[PDB]
Amino acid sequence: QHWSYXLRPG
C-alpha cells in the first residue's frame, strides 16, 4: 500500500 514501507513483508 505504500512504497515507503521498503521491504516490510506485504
Exposure letters 1-10 (e unless 16+ CB within 10 A, then b): eeeeeeeeee
Structural biology method used: X-ray
Resolution (A): 0.9
Cell digits of residue 1: 500500500
DSSP structure string for 1-10: --GGGTT---
Q: Please tell me the number of Cα atoms within 13 Å of 7 on its side-chain side.
A: 0
* Residue whose C-alpha cell is 516490510: 8
